[PDB]
Enzyme design. Structure first.
Site, PDB file in Angstrom:
ATOM      1  N   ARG A 168      22.990  53.098 -59.539  1.00 55.14           N
ATOM      2  CA  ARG A 168      24.237  52.910 -58.804  1.00 55.14           C
ATOM      3  C   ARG A 168      24.004  53.392 -57.376  1.00 55.14           C
ATOM      4  NH1 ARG A 168      27.674  49.221 -60.514  1.00 55.14           N
ATOM      5  NH2 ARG A 168      28.005  50.006 -62.645  1.00 55.14           N
ATOM      6  N   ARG A 169      24.203  52.501 -56.404  1.00 57.93           N
ATOM      7  CA  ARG A 169      23.802  52.820 -55.037  1.00 57.93           C
ATOM      8  C   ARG A 169      24.601  53.991 -54.474  1.00 57.93           C
ATOM      9  NH1 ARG A 169      21.196  48.792 -50.983  1.00 57.93           N
ATOM     10  NH2 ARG A 169      20.212  48.564 -53.051  1.00 57.93           N
ATOM     11  N   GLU A 191      13.271  40.343 -52.727  1.00 57.97           N
ATOM     12  CA  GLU A 191      12.993  39.588 -51.513  1.00 57.97           C
ATOM     13  C   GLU A 191      13.952  38.399 -51.404  1.00 57.97           C
ATOM     14  OE1 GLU A 191       8.682  39.186 -51.286  1.00 57.97           O
ATOM     15  OE2 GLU A 191       8.672  41.220 -50.443  1.00 57.97           O
ATOM     16  N   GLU A 216      22.201  43.999 -65.486  1.00 58.15           N
ATOM     17  CA  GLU A 216      20.836  44.472 -65.691  1.00 58.15           C
ATOM     18  C   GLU A 216      20.680  45.078 -67.072  1.00 58.15           C
ATOM     19  OE1 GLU A 216      20.303  46.991 -62.249  1.00 58.15           O
ATOM     20  OE2 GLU A 216      20.169  45.233 -60.935  1.00 58.15           O
TER      21      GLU A 216
END
Lengths: 140, 140
Positions: free
Chosen positions: B9-10, B39, B82
């Site tokens: 979790r950012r 990317e 995810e």
């Protein structure tokens, strides 16, 4: 004798301080961080001695990291004490900014207000290699 | 194809996630973390393929890390997606606990309740090298 002392606030900067320690060691610096190198004895003396021994003083400015220095006129807060030692000894002070809100200098004790005049580095999650590169450039 | 995917979790686990990436790379593991390896292209495809490609799925459970998955019925949350991919592919899931409060399975979407059945590793700031050594033992 370590080349770098890492000063940080446990409840908010422990992970960044540890990340800094790993990267700086990888690049050949001897790093003091308390969890790795503070050993037996009276910790107030040992911590002040470890600041004095290190040419570089890396200050992790996580959110609220200087809150406990505010109104600490008796200089009992450990971060306040480390900063005053670094200032008194003329260390190469390198603040690392991670979500830190810069307070006005007059809400801090006068003996540490000069810490705000040092050029800081902004920790970039997206550009971490370049952040580390910049820190290494600042170190002596 | 990297051996380890790091899901995190950012807002709360970015620092630990990057600390884990460095340590695992230093021990010779190929690590996928978005800020270094995600990317160009449509990111939802790429991140799912990256989970599918890694044998190990390292899940950073910082405080409140699953809050955004709760009542995410259409599975639009990226950590939710995810985890579902990791479980669907039978990956070696390795939860890393750092101040995380274990929810009851009822509050999580059905397709990710199984994540709570995996043996987790508690992050110890005081014994970080031992924590890393334990994670490496869990990895395949």
């Amino acid at each position: 004798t370590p080349d770098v002392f890492i000063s940080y606030r446990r409840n908010s900067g422990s992970q960044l301080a540890s990340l800094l320690k790993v990267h700086l060691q990888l690049h050949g610096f001897s790093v003091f961080i308390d969890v790795e190198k503070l050993e037996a004895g009276k910790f107030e003396d040992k911590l002040i001695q470890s600041v004095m021994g290190a040419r570089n003083f890396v200050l992790v400015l996580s959110p609220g990291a200087l809150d406990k220095c505010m109104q600490d006129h008796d200089c009992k807060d450990w971060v306040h004490k480390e900063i005053v030692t670094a200032l008194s000894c003329g260390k190469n002070i390198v603040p690392i900014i991670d979500g830190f809100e810069w307070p006005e200098p007059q809400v801090l004790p006068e003996d540490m207000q000069a810490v705000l005049t040092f050029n800081g580095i902004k920790w970039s999650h997206e550009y971490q290699e370049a952040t580390i590169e910049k820190i290494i450039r600042f170190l002596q």
